[PDB]
Write a protein that binds this ligand. Structure first.
Ligand SMILES: [Mg+2]
Ligand SMILES: [Zn+2]
Ligand SMILES: [Zn+2]
Ligand SMILES: [Zn+2]
Lengths: 83, 267, 171, 96, 540, 110, 157
């Protein structure tokens, strides 16, 4: 039932699955004409643009980590420490 | 039978291995919380060696001439000798290593010191010596409190569970005890000031690399460990006094009421 | 009947509508779909009260297509017919089976068998009108119809009325 | 080519559920059916040329759900209904 | 490609399994099915009211399926029924019903023993339903007499007989000895006199399961979408086995009704009742032990539903857990040292056969436009276009139209070019390393080319071994497949914490001779060796 | 003692074959066989005789019997099992699909 | 039917979007017009706010000025405004407050008082025949009095 921010006791590191689905969904949105928040260096492939947004944490998403008891947490990808 | 036996088993976002119905098989995956892709065979320096070598290595005396400290090892060696506080810290570290040696004597009764553990310390030490140009005949700027308090401050940074209650911290300490013993064994004052001759930035870089690699050796929540175990057991079955091999494996997995060779080993 | 009820709707948005002003778009969609349409559970939706304090809750991303799903809770004025409900209306279309009364956004039908015996159908007039022993039911005439039954199909609601009983007929 | 059981088990070992869903739906067969709210059976007559639905035997013409299941699963459900077994499907969690 | 629907789209969560009540069967069905004939008397259309009438589903595409309309690729099917005049038993429940006959009185319909017994009090405290029914059955199967007065209670007292299974029947033995065969109507009556606490104490739920529902009274008729008939050459028409079984049920039912309408020979009634019970029993499960096996007129056993749900490669193994899928290629694999570790050489014919649907974006509108203007014959081309309306135009016969301009939001299906990750697999595939993604490199000939540092996790050898190649059809699954499945991301297997891939064969035998102290190379060859390195800095 | 002995028995065949397997996998396997008390067989009578959902149990071996008992006893399935989500043909809670992805409208204005 | 037993969403017990309990809101064809015509005004102010950066003619003209506000997809609401206005005899929310004071003084059901205020009757038998739920729940003389005060509250506009 939405655990508050002071009680979030999950791993602050972004896993490979979270990075994978964030890059996949973000790249899918970029392929569907989504507003890009980072200036492009001449890229054409959507996955490279998604990784470019992840490298600067400009992806506007938040992860709803489901807990085994039915609860969940909201860890934004901007505050998640990548790698 | 192995694939369909271990299928609906995974690790949720709490570092606890439980199936889809919520039945807890293991409170911690692998009883340590480490993935099988970052573990390397390490040697335990606490049990290895004789008693004369143990006391010759892990004793750095300052008020006694039995295991005194060579002042040429560090720059301020002329001022470290005669200090009671650093000698007390060396007493606490030595007693901690002795307790770790008794604990390792109770855990491993076979005498082997090579066991698979995460984080390779030797490569970090060699990368630090080859990075900071650490050669021989070079006095170090470290002291006793820097290494002792550095290790003691690194032991608290090792975190696998992100909780703060009693049982969570108990499982964290009981799941980090062995690795902390390895770090206290490889990170001694004599081993750094005498052999390694590490400096300040080199030692701090080694600490940051050990903590970092320890934070990367953590198993990720959401990985299918039951299928990975069923494959890790079923794959060696293809290469295949008491009966061994595939029939014995059949008797073990089926849990048969009678074995092909019911033998005992009376000690 | 003209009732007021708090309704909830799931709005789908294309990934191209994720600008900072997207909330406005939501309300825009929330109007264009809700006002004027009809539902078989709440009746003909007329208006939507409270346009400033519209709750947005939290938007969720469904798997494929990447479109956004929203759950909006608002207050709206809707119209729902009921069985055996006396209403008033004006005729629009005329038929040999009966004249079609217009009650608000609903076009109720009155069967000829559900009419008194003195009320007869007249096709020789333009437009064809129902002439009785005192009242003449024409298009522009106002008739009080007692609705006997209503049908609540999805996005389509039709009802059946009658004027055979007393205190009914032309107004 | 046949995407057998061991291949699916390998896809589970890698942890890719989207590729498994796509391989077992769009890459093979994907069917769309309508189920009823009261009873979770496929008796919902769908005449959507005029946007009309029914479910026979439970008096519903409003609450009709749409689900995408593979055609083989629909064959399983229809064979269970032919075998006097009710595979009722519910989109909501009543047990909670 | 199906037609759009306005119903709300949701996922399938909870699934409830229960028995089919006869009233619900009659409420779901639409036809009665009275004529055992297949098609109409005019040898065309359908019988209209028979085994396969338009009131059910239809095939042949051209037919519309009256009661759904639409087409066969949309028709879920429709259900018929069969109203029997004599109740029959279900095979998979014959035992269970028998156990119920050993758990309840055969007259007053009350549970044997009572709540005053201590063993019953202990058995009722169990939360598991199957264990409750088991233990309560072990207690009630011994006491063979209901009682009227029990010291610290219902009446009856009639000696409970011994129920034995024999030839799909249940014979009751009274000692008093009077042995009488228990009929289906009597057992069904006793089941109708069962109180709520009785069957709910056995493990039944009123809203889902009933002992009266366990006894079959009305039979659902599945549509041809389940048993698709064939009309080959218009003169060789084949009907499925379940259709013949339904014909047998109709002939036995109408025969039993005719024999029970006028007169009663008492013996032909039992022969027709056992005949209908045999047709329904073999209809549900033909492979029943202790009973004769129904054989078709061709010379093969009758295919039942249980046979479709029991054997391997059926509905569970060959249609749910696994299946034959599209977007794949199988051929012989061979080595090529000039390729990279993660790549794979794909033949040009396979690259032109398989395809991938890409989304038209302003970044590749010119490139995809070039692919459209090249044609399906050339390799750098396309095959089909999908407009934003959800409609596919084939590039073939589209050149007859003239020009095809692309817009934003369309999906053009191109051929497999370079840098396209696809899954590579080799049966039986017992490792998670046996299925790994790869980067496509288009090469001629017909064999899959790959590096020899990947043949060790595949357990393969270049001697006629074929492999499988699957292609993802979405960008999300392609990115998730590239970030989770990769040859560099699978160098160190978690099996034995050691790298599974290494230098094998002639390269390992050559690197040893190269690393010998007697090995010396001249300048003219050293230059070529240093230039053969792809990432060589250029410093000799 | 039954647990540790089981682990020794399995480990023995592995070391006899001349192969190495990590401690994690064997530990998991041994634990699964002992979490319901006693020793539990790895058979079609060793996990299809305990509740896991009618589909998950029916998929392995005896399909018709499990389905018939399920419908008879009015059994309910939770439908978060692997095989169940596979059969129904939608996303399962494994890896990438073990978490939902959301959007924060307060982050779009950043 | 018309036996004080409506549907599920039309039961006497309603729940708002905050989670509190609220009685069913039943409106007669008097204030029901002033509420739509009311909210459309503030809707016009909301449409002209973001833009920066005898009785029938006014009805149809205002319905046109509000039709320009909407996207031309809800004209049945304007035709409903013509229906109500052509069948409305009330005006001003103060008098409507008096009408609610006269309807709530008897202690009846909201749907019943809605059918009372929405229908034009002269005797009590008319109210008892057009409303099958009211036949003995309230006295006839009191209904005739309510129809008298209402008859004094109606004015040809
Ligand atoms: Mg071979
Ligand atoms: Zn239904
Ligand atoms: Zn149909
Ligand atoms: Zn009795």
């Amino acid at each position: 039932k939405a655990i508050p921010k002071d009680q979030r006791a999950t791993t602050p590191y972004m896993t490979k699955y979270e990075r994978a689905r964030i890059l996949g969904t973000r790249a899918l949105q970029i392929s569907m004409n989504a507003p890009v928040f980072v200036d492009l260096e001449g890229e054409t492939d959507p996955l490279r643009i998604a990784m470019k947004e992840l490298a600067e944490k400009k992806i506007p998403l938040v992860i709803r980590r489901y807990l085994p008891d039915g609860s969940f947490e909201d860890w934004s990808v901007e505050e998640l420490i990548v790698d | 039978r192995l694939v369909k036996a271990l299928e609906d088993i995974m690790v949720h976002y709490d570092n606890t291995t439980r199936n889809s119905l919520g039945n807890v098989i293991q409170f911690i995956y692998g009883e340590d919380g480490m993935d099988a892709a970052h573990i390397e065979k390490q040697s335990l320096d606490t049990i290895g060696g004789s008693d004369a070598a143990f006391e010759k290595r892990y004793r750095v005396d300052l008020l006694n001439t039995d295991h005194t400290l060579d002042p040429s090892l560090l720059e301020s060696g002329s001022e470290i000798l005669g200090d009671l506080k650093l000698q007390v810290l060396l007493d606490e570290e030595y007693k901690q290593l002795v307790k770790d040696r008794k604990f390792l004597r109770e855990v491993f009764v076979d005498g082997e010191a090579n066991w698979p553990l995460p984080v390779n310390i030797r490569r970090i030490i060699q990368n630090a010596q080859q990075t900071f140009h650490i050669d021989h005949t070079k006095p170090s700027d470290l002291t006793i409190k820097d290494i002792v308090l550095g290790v003691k401050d690194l032991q608290e940074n090792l975190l696998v569970l992100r909780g703060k209650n009693e049982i969570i911290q108990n499982a964290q300490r009981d799941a980090v005890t062995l690795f902390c013993c390895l770090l206290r064994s490889r990170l001694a004052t004599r081993r750094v000031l005498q052999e390694y001759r590490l400096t300040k930035q080199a030692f701090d870089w080694v600490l940051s690399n050990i903590e970092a690699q320890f934070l990367r050796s953590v198993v990720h929540p959401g990985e299918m460990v039951g299928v990975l175990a069923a494959q890790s057991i079923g794959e060696p079955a293809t290469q295949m006094k008491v009966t061994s091999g595939v029939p014995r494996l059949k008797e073990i997995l089926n849990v048969a009421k009678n074995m092909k060779t019911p033998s005992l080993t009376v000690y | 009947m003209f009732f007021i009820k708090d309704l909830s709707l799931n709005i789908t948005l294309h990934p191209s509508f994720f600008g900072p002003r997207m909330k406005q778009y939501l309300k825009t969609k929330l109007l264009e779909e809700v006002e004027g349409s009809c539902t078989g559970k709440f009746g003909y939706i007329l208006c939507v009260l409270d346009y400033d304090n519209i709750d947005i809750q939290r938007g969720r991303i469904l798997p494929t297509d990447g479109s956004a799903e929203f759950n909006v809770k608002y207050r709206a004025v809707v119209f729902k017919p009921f069985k055996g409900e006396v209403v008033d209306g004006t005729v629009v279309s005329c038929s040999q089976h009966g004249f079609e009364v217009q009650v608000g956004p609903m076009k109720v039908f009155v069967t000829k068998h559900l009419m008194p015996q003195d009320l007869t159908f007249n096709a020789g007039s333009n437009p064809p009108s129902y002439q009785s022993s005192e009242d003449v039911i024409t298009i522009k005439s106002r008739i009080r119809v007692k609705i006997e039954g209503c049908i609540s199909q999805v996005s389509s609601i039709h009802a059946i009325g009658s004027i055979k009983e007393d205190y009914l007929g032309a107004i | 080519l046949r995407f057998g059981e061991m291949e699916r088990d390998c896809m589970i070992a890698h942890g890719a559920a989207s590729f498994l869903k796509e391989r077992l739906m769009e890459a093979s067969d994907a069917f769309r059916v309508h189920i009823c709210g009261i009873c979770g059976l496929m008796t919902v007559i769908a005449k959507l040329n005029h946007n009309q639905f029914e479910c026979k035997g439970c008096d519903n013409k409003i609450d009709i759900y749409q689900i995408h299941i593979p055609y083989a699963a629909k064959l399983l459900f229809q064979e269970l209904m032919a075998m006097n077994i009710t595979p009722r499907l519910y989109t909501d969690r009543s047990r909670d | 490609g199906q037609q759009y629907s306005s119903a709300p789209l949701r996922t399938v969560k909870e699934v409830q399994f229960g028995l089919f009540s006869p009233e619900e069967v009659r409420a779901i069905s639409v036809a009665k099915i009275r004529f055992p004939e297949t098609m109409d008397e005019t040898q065309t259309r359908a019988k209209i009211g028979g085994l396969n009438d338009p009131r059910l589903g239809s095939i042949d595409r051209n037919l519309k399926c009256q009661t759904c309309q639409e087409g066969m690729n949309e028709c879920p099917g429709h259900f018929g029924h069969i109203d029997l005049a004599k109740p029959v038993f279900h095979v998979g429940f014959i035992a269970k019903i028998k156990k119920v006959c050993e758990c309840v009185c055969m007259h007053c319909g009350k549970l044997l023993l009572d709540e005053h017994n201590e063993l019953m009090r202990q058995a009722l405290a169990i939360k598991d339903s199957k264990k409750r029914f088991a233990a309560i059955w072990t207690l009630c199967k011994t006491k063979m007499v209901c009682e009227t007065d029990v010291p610290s209670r219902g009446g009856c007292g009639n000696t409970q007989p011994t129920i034995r299974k024999d030839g799909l029947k249940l014979v009751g033995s009274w000692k008093k000895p009077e042995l009488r065969v228990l009929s289906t109507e009597e057992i069904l009556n006793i089941f109708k006199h069962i109180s709520v606490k009785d069957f709910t104490s056995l493990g039944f739920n009123e809203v889902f399961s009933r002992p009266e529902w366990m006894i079959l009274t009305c039979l659902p008729v599945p549509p041809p979408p389940v048993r698709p008939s064939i009309s080959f050459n218009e003169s060789q028409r084949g009907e499925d086995d379940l259709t013949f079984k339904l014909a047998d049920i109709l002939k036995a039912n109408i025969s039993l009704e005719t024999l029970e309408h006028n007169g009663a020979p008492h013996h032909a009634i039992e022969e027709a009742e056992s005949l209908l019970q045999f047709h329904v029993a073999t209809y549900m499960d033909n492979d029943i032990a202790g009973q004769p096996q129904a054989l078709q007129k061709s010379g093969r056993p009758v295919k039942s539903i249980r046979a479709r749900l029991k054997g391997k490669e059926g509905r569970i193994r060959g249609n749910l857990m696994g299946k034959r899928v599209d977007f794949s290629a199988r051929t012989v694999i061979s080595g090529d040292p000039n390729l990279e570790l993660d790549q794979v050489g794909v033949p040009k014919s396979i690259a032109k056969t398989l395809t991938y649907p890409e989304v038209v974006t302003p970044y590749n509108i010119d490139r995809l436009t070039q692919l459209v203007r090249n044609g399906p014959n050339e390799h750098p081309g396309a095959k089909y276009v999908i407009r934003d309306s959800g409609d596919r135009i084939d590039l073939r016969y589209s050149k007859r139209a003239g020009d095809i301009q692309l817009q934003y939001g369309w999906k053009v299906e191109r051929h497999i070019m370079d840098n396209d990750p696809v899954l590579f697999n080799r049966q039986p595939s017992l490792h998670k390393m046996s299925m790994m993604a790869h980067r496509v490199k288009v090469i001629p000939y017909s064999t899959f080319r790959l590096n020899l540092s990947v043949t060790s996790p595949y357990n393969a050898d270049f001697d006629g071994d074929e492999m499988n190649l699957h292609v993802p059809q979405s960008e999300e699954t392609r990115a998730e497949l590239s970030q989770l499945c990769a040859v560099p991301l699978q160098i160190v297997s978690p099996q034995s914490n050691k790298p599974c891939m290494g230098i094998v064969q002639d390269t390992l035998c050559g690197i040893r001779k190269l690393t010998l102290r007697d090995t010396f190379i001249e300048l003219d060859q050293v230059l070529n060796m240093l230039y053969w390195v792809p990432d060589w800095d250029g410093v000799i | 003692a039954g647990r540790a002995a089981l682990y020794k028995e399995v480990y023995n065949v592995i070391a006899s074959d001349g192969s190495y397997v990590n401690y994690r996998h064997m530990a998991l396997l041994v634990d699964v066989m002992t979490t319901q008390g006693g020793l539990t067989s790895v058979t079609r009578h060793g996990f299809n005789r305990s509740n896991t959902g009618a589909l998950m149990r029916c998929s392995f071996e005896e399909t018709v019997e499990i389905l018939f008992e399920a419908g008879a006893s009015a059994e309910l399935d939770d439908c978060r099992g692997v095989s169940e989500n596979v059969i129904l043909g939608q996303m399962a809670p494994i890896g990438t699909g073990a978490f939902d992805v959301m959007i924060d409208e307060e982050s779009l204005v950043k | 039917a018309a036996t004080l037993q409506l549907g599920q969403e039309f039961q006497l017990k309603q729940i708002n979007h905050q989670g509190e309990e609220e009685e069913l809101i039943a409106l007669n064809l008097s204030e029901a017009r002033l509420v739509i015509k009311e909210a459309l005004v503030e809707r016009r102010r909301a449409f002209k706010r973001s833009q920066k950066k005898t009785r029938e003619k006014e009805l149809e003209s205002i319905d046109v000025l509000l039709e320009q506000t909407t996207g031309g997809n809800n004209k049945d609401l304007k035709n409903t405004m013509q229906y109500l206005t052509n069948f409305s005899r009330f005006r001003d929310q103060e008098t409507v407050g008096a009408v609610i004071q006269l309807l709530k003084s008897t202690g009846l059901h909201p749907f019943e008082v809605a059918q009372l205020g929405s229908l034009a009757c002269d005797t009590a038998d008319e109210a008892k025949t057009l409303i099958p739920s009211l036949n003995n729940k309230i006295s006839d003389d009191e209904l005739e009095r309510i129809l008298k005060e209402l008859s004094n509250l109606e004015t040809l506009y």
